[PDB]
């Protein structure tokens, strides 16, 4: 059976701190900010061609 409100391990105040202060919103905000500070994947086309095989057609 899915557990009710009263068979929950955390308090209602502890749950409301996650509810009002957007606990996992800032986590996903932090992930995209981590991606802001690393070196991108992008390549110049008319002056560099991507990696190819000998069996290419």
């Amino acid at each position: 059976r899915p557990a009710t409100w009263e068979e929950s391990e955390e308090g209602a105040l502890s749950k409301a701190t996650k509810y009002f202060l957007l606990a996992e919103m800032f986590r996903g905000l932090y992930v995209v900010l981590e991606q802001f500070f690393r070196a991108p994947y992008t390549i110049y086309y008319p002056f560099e061609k991507g990696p190819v095989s000998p069996r290419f057609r």
Binding site: F20, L21, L22, M25, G28, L29, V31, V32, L33, Q35, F36, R38, P40, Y41, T42
Partner: protein
Amino acid sequence: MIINIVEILIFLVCVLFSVAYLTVAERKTLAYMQRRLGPNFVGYYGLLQAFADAVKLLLKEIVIILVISPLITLITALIGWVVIPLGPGITLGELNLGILFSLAIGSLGVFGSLLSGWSSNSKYSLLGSIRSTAQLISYELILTSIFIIIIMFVSSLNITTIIETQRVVWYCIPLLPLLLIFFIASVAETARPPFDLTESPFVFFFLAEYSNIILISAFNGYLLLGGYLSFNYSYLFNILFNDYSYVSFLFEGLINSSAYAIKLVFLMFSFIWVRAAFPRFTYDNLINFCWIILLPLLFGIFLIIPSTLYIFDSFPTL
């Protein structure tokens, strides 16, 4: 005469520039959020993007009212720039009822959303324009109600009076939940995409959009965060300068505008930063979020503030 026309020249030209460089800043930072180069560059040549696509945007097709709503949307977005102060007592027009004006123009800004749906009408497109209008007014409520609970500590409708009151402590640090809910109500006035069902002559809506972006950033910056205030800086000057001179007033106006622009720039970056990370809302979720859950908290914060001013002496004098 010449004394003030050069002054409004400098201000209009600076704000007109800054709104255009935001259209480049958003493309760049969302490029590096997703590991692309994005636009090639950002310099003095860097406006020639936003210039060039602002030119080419005037080359497509459109299919008396259609003339008026982009116009009134842009002039409503542009007249609200006087009333922000940029330094102590520096306004383009000084008025004791600046928040009442700022509030009346946040009220005037809704009309272009109505009159845009009339042009090239369908049944379903008209309904969609209705939905964008109703979310715009719905979050305008909580905007206005928190303006009240900020000026409860000031008890004055002047804006430099707010910031000079704010000198001892910013209003953001006691009322931190208020900062959080204002930031989301601030990306709610605008159509920023956590809050953008109802999107997903055009040059005026395009310009006035970013002008509203940076202008509600200004409205955050003076009343919640410190407006032009960074620190006390009384001690550094007594070592640098010997007496008041035009160099000294230049240096202080410079550091005050720097402290204002850093607030506005970090907040403006956070708008584009909250754009990328989240998907958008169902409209029922939008209205439900505005009314049923957030606004009872708003009545509660509204009752808990005067009672806290009541428990101590602490009523603010005009």
